[PDB]
Symmetry: C2
Subunit: 370 residues, 2 copies
Amino acid sequence: DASGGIILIIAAALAMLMANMGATSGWYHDFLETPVQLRVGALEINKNMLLWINDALMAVFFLLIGLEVKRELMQGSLASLRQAAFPVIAAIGGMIVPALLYLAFNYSDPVTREGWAIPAATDIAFALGVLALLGSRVPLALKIFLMALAIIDDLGAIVIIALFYTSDLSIVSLGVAAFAIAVLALLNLCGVRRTGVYILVGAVLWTAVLKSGVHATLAGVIVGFFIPLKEKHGRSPAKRLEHVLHPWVAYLILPLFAFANAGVSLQGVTIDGLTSMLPLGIIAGLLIGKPLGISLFCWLALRFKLAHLPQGTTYQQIMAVGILCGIGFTMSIFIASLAFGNVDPELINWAKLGILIGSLLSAVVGYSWL
Amino acid sequence: DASGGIILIIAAALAMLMANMGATSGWYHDFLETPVQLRVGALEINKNMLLWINDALMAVFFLLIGLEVKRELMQGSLASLRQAAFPVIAAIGGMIVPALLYLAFNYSDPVTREGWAIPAATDIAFALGVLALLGSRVPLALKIFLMALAIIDDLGAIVIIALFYTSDLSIVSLGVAAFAIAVLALLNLCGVRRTGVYILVGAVLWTAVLKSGVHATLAGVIVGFFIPLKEKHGRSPAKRLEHVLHPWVAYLILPLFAFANAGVSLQGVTIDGLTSMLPLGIIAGLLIGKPLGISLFCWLALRFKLAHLPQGTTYQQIMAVGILCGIGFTMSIFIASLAFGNVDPELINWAKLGILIGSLLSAVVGYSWLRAR
């Protein structure tokens, strides 16, 4: 139910408490920046504590998404080219319009315009938690629409970042990554169904691209795509694994990720500081860019014939979830950590402020459409 | 069946090829010798590639042992209240005589006296493997007697090495370790029946004692204890975990440990070199120390009515397990790597030579004689 949503806010509230109390804000920041060096012979992997944690947490979190994308692409909303016509059009609008509003503020600064995909992400656990809070009798199709709409935006942003803006990996790293994916394919063609063997090869895929954070995340998506879904003898590996991971993701992965990232110091924050191009551009793309692009493109889809409509929607509850897609929260925080790495350290801190202001505003306003 | 015993031999044979032919002897030695360093701020751990592998593989293997030895001690072979007090007295003899026979050779050398527990271990996968090889009609109580006999020896060897022949851990490491045992015990009393919560907590215990390979192995059996075994709603967390684990242990963890440790260079190995106090002390401790220690101790317990008897015993079939308990192999190579760490690097290599010869001779004699009776 909505239990994952509340337990996620408590984790972020404690993180905000840790980063703003004089007795804790100091050990909290110094722990996250603790250098961790693994040196295997000549190879060494240097990255701080928070980067190791995020690369491992977001790996198993996107493993669940890869299993959920595979379900909807073969059995759910995205199964047919016509049922998927409504979430995809909503995601395109739910991404280009938030990015346009963000780039409208940050186009003049070449340093901040690289994080245009920050207001395009959507916290699935937070948005689903809001729906389940009032969801005693909300349309079930809305929950599968919101989940399908939020997944493509997050997965696309991860793919778009890992395709272009990423830094290329070692020439040896891609040779092992290609071999691990080939083993994942031969394992799928030969009909093996031991889920652990896919996890085992996934570790080699995750380790080979460890230096790149967005590729270690995509490694989980690739493993989730290759785990078979067939229902032989009434059992399915991907279906079972998605069931097993869900309590661990909703109660340990996402809460820990929120506790290590959603904590910024509020000292010195002013309204004039929050109205600067970086945070306000995130607030605009989340609070306004999300519902403006989702509503417009769905409205464009509806009138201009390429459309559909989930059973029992009424197209005024679409706008309500278009506001709930403005809850970037942990997903926009992770995207901001990828785009603002190895740059000025206050870029990520201002991004987290614009996200949390926009997310809480989009949550309260979207909830108020009872 | 005996599929794990064969894979365990191909991996040891592959390791022997890797550590002998010139095209791979350079890589195989330099790979296991590769130093791996993890620096967490001020903290730092330095262990070679082989130690990082052995601490990870043997911790998983002893999680299975911790599950099996709890199944027996609570509702299985060993059980409670002296049900199977017959393998317990036999295991004392399968360790006292193998160690004393070893020390008869090495007592004059203070360096090799420390490896007295090497001929006391027993490779359960290989010893059970040769049973099932011929075993269309082997007494089933005989098999479970072996498995129960080998676990008591291997667990007692790890405990003794961890209580005396181990290195000191920091008090900060013991504090987190003790706290990890407490939250494990609180998970058990409160009725938590989810395996993943125990393994996660157990991972903290393993990393806390990571600077000691013997304690990282004990972290496996301790977590194997606190996994609940109750049958609520017809489901047991320890039984499903043991069922899931067993194929991994027999097909992945055991062969990989053999491929990484059973590889020794045979160049320069003469017959005179194999009869030194260190190798020959292991040949006698396994090929002779195990049978004489097992047979005599069951016989002294049997005659004095303190013992028992398995079903389908003969008592002439028993000592066929004695020569079968001479199978040290991977379980003795691991004990040898613990007792001969941070010393002359040829002590472990000479010990591995004495472990494989005494085991192979124990396998052939143990098989060629049990097939008769």
